[PDB]
């Protein structure tokens with residue numbers, strides 16, 4: 001799979017498990033079209049969102065549902081979600097890992113981009 | 117002002133100057149309505165976006181034009197922009213600082229909410 | 232003052248108040264000599280650590296007592312402390328801000344070096 | 347192995363490869379005794395530093411040689427290194443991943459602690 005999402009919890013020192021993730025792709029009319037969704041596993045990783053064939057060039061938005069995560073654990077966090085928006089595959093196919101480290105009032109995110 | 121935005125550059129160890137920032141408020145029909153905007157100053161800060169009277173409870177989005185910032189430095193970045201989405205609550209402390217720390221392939225954001 | 236330390240709490244979205252900070256300078260024999268210390272204020276900031284005359288070029292260590300901070304909040308943290316080690320250079324901008332953002336199992340640190 | 351170190355580069359969007367790492371353990375006389383060392387692989391990971399038998403209770407310091415990393419790439423960074431100091435195994439053996447995300451004037455670090 002050319003798109004993976006990994007989420008860690010900076011309060012517990014653990015993977016962030018069961019985090020809902022929704023991916024969108026910008027359509028020709030400039031709207032966000034639903035593309036794929038899933039939830040992180042016990043390792044904090046979400047695999048299998050898409051395929052090389054379906055992950056064409058485009059502008060993608062990876063929405064990480066951080067508020068639902070913290071609220072499911074009884075914490076009242078600051079952000080509604082974390083959004084990661086990027087152009088993908090504009091120089092040919094690449095593999096993308098979108099990582100995020102969560103705290104109730106802060107998050108970090110980075111990307112690892114590799115050429116298969 | 118109840119809302120301030122600060123942007124820092126982790127590559128050069130400096131404020132991120134002249135970064136465009138747009139603030140939106142979520143409307144009843146679930147669309148994003150323009151609310152306020154500006155460019156960060158020489159200190160990386162953007163003051164005066166709004167007033168206590170105008171900054172009512174609701175859901176707000178702060179969009180930071182990180183791509184244009186890096187492109188002006190001759191660096192090709194990963195993200196189209198950085199977006200910070202949050203609910204303003206009256207119960208909470210009154211003043212909101214939204215800080216972002218930028219690298220070409222990474223950003224962090226935190227909220228400092230105080231009296 | 233050429234050196235300021237700022238500490239923020241990512242769990243509560245607030246300054247980290249009353250955090251002990253110790254600064255050391257590396258001596259010729261490679262040991263760490265005490266240089267300055269204090270506690271962060273209600274704004275999470277520690278000002279007045281040193282002067283331009285005293286802050287000569289060299290290697291400095293800023294140790295932030297993060298463990299005591301979390302323990303006072305009833306939270307068990309991972310790190311013994313956070314340490315920031317850097318060289319002061321005269322060529323560079325004059326004023327150094329060392330910022331740290333704290334969570335129980337994580338911290339970030341950045342330097343803002345300006346004129 | 348119960349201790350792993352992973353390092354990423356936030357400028358390049360890639361693993362941080364060939365980063366030197368030195369681990370120390372506080373001795374009874376309060377000095378930092380050398381414990382293990384190595385360098386990150388092409389994946390940004392450093393495996394095999396120690397064993398369950400030799401990784402006893404103690405206070406450990408993981409020194410990540412960030413300045414040498416950036417300088418080997420011709421960048422002049424702010425920090426001399428990144429130091430991660432923690433008590434390990436005080437409630438029995440655990441597995442520790444020490445992660446770090448590097449920029450020239452900033453770094454983040456987190457831990458993932460699991461119970462085998």
Ligand SMILES: Cc1cc([N+](=O)[O-])c(O)c([N+](=O)[O-])c1
Nearest residue numbers: 215224225226330339340341
């Ligand atoms: C002021 C500041 C410092 C750091 N830092 O790295 O020390 C940060 O990460 C952030 N932030 O927004 O996440 C803000």
Ligand SMILES: Cc1cc([N+](=O)[O-])c(O)c([N+](=O)[O-])c1
Nearest residue numbers: 006099354443445446447458
């Ligand atoms: C910083 C970081 C740490 C871990 N980690 O395992 O702690 C990761 O897996 C990743 N990543 O990209 O997948 C990044």
Ligand code: NA
Nearest residue numbers: 089090091092
């Ligand atoms: Na192209």
Ligand code: NA
Nearest residue numbers: 435436437438
């Ligand atoms: Na014990």
